[PDB]
Amino acid sequence: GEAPNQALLRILKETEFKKIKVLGSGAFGTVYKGLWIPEGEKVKIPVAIKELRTSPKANKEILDEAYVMASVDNPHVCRLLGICLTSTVQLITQLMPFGCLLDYVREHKDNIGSQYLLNWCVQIAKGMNYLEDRRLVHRDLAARNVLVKTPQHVKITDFGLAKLLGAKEYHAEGGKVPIKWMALESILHRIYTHQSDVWSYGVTVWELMTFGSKPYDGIPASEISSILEKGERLPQPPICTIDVYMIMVKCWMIDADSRPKFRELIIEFSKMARDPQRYLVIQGDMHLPDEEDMDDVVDADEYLIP
Numbered sequence: 001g002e003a004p005n006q007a008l009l010r011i012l013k014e015t016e017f018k019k020i021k022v023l024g025s026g027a028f029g030t031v032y033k034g035l036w037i038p039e040g041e042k043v044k045i046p047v048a049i050k051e052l053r054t055s056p057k058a059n060k061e062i063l064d065e066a067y068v069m070a071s072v073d074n075p076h077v078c079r080l081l082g083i084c085l086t087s088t089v090q091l092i093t094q095l096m097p098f099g100c101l102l103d104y105v106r107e108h109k110d111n112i113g114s115q116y117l118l119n120w121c122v123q124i125a126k127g128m129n130y131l132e133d134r135r136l137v138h139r140d141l142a143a144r145n146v147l148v149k150t151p152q153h154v155k156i157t158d159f160g161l162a163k164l165l166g167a168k169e170y171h172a173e174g175g176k177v178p179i180k181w182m183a184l185e186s187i188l189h190r191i192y193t194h195q196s197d198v199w200s201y202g203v204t205v206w207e208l209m210t211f212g213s214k215p216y217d218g219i220p221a222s223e224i225s226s227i228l229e230k231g232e233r234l235p236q237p238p239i240c241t242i243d244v245y246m247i248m249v250k251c252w253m254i255d256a257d258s259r260p261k262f263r264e265l266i267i268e269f270s271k272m273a274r275d276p277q278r279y280l281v282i283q284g285d286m287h288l289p290d291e292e293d294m295d296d297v298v299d300a301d302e303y304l305i306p
């Protein structure tokens with residue numbers, strides 16, 4: 001009873017990309033930055049190229065993420081531009097120039113205002129609510145997997161763990177999971193739901209309000225299941241009014257259904273962003289903020305080929 005996924009998978013000539021530099025080779029794999037110039041179009045699109053870190057049927061998992069990324073279209077979700085089928089299979093996506101939100105919140109923590117924090121909360125809840133519309137469970141929502149296009153615009157990324165549900169619960173089998181972001185049911189029963197992502201959304205909000213603190217810092221991930229059963233949660237961050245912390249606490253409730261819906265999280269944080277200093281107490285509420293031949297540079301969000 002599902003609709004045909006008529007998304008288009010664009011195969012891109014390795015010749016179309018130029019000026020490729022290195023952006024990082026962390027746990028996400030070797031990621032490059034560069035310019036994608038579609039032949040005979042006179043546009044230069046800043047892109048990120050990612051190959052997993054050979055030909056060891058890891059080539060299989062990278063196509064799984066491309067499938068998901070090619071099937072999403074939302075201003076707060078990173079969309080796949082295309083894949084390059086050279087010796088390595090590469091994901092080509094829109095370049096998010098300011099990097100992950102986790103490193104951004106750390107490196108600019110003395111210049112992030114309550115307006116920015118509450119707005120990021122709205123945008124992530126809009127992206128997640130879109131992923132819920134498309135019957136998609138992210139299973140890896142964290143501040144590290146939210147990229148920053150501009151300080152005013154963030155998008156959810158990294159769909160390696162993402163899984164598409166039929167027409168409610170998903171049962172994983174094994175492998176490295178981010179324990180400190182998962183709902184209790186995801187830890188004990190390996191059940192994942194849109195409401196399991198709400199728990200992850202809660203930990204993601206806690207990362208921002210603490211300006212990039214490590215959740216459950218210095219405590220072995222094997223202990224996490226037990227202390228969460230004892231009724232323990234993450235602490236109230238200093239800048240957080242009880243209003244904002246009460247929303248985070250609601251995301252970590254043991255009854256998965258009595259947790260907030262992503263559509264309800266948009267509404268509450270939207271109302272809060274209407275008056276940010278009433279809900280986030282931050283000292284000094286502040287402002288926030290590529291090579292020469294740039295005449296034909298078009299950001300990917302304005303390059304729309306149907």
Ligand SMILES: *CCC(=O)N1CC(Oc2nn(C(C)(C)C)c3ncnc(N)c23)C1
Nearest residue numbers: 024028031048050094095096099100103
């Ligand atoms: C927060 C540190 C970090 O995770 N990263 C910096 C590096 O940048 C980066 N990674 N990707 C993907 C493709 C691996 C998700 C990007 N896509 C787009 N733009 C940037 N800057 C990306 C990841």
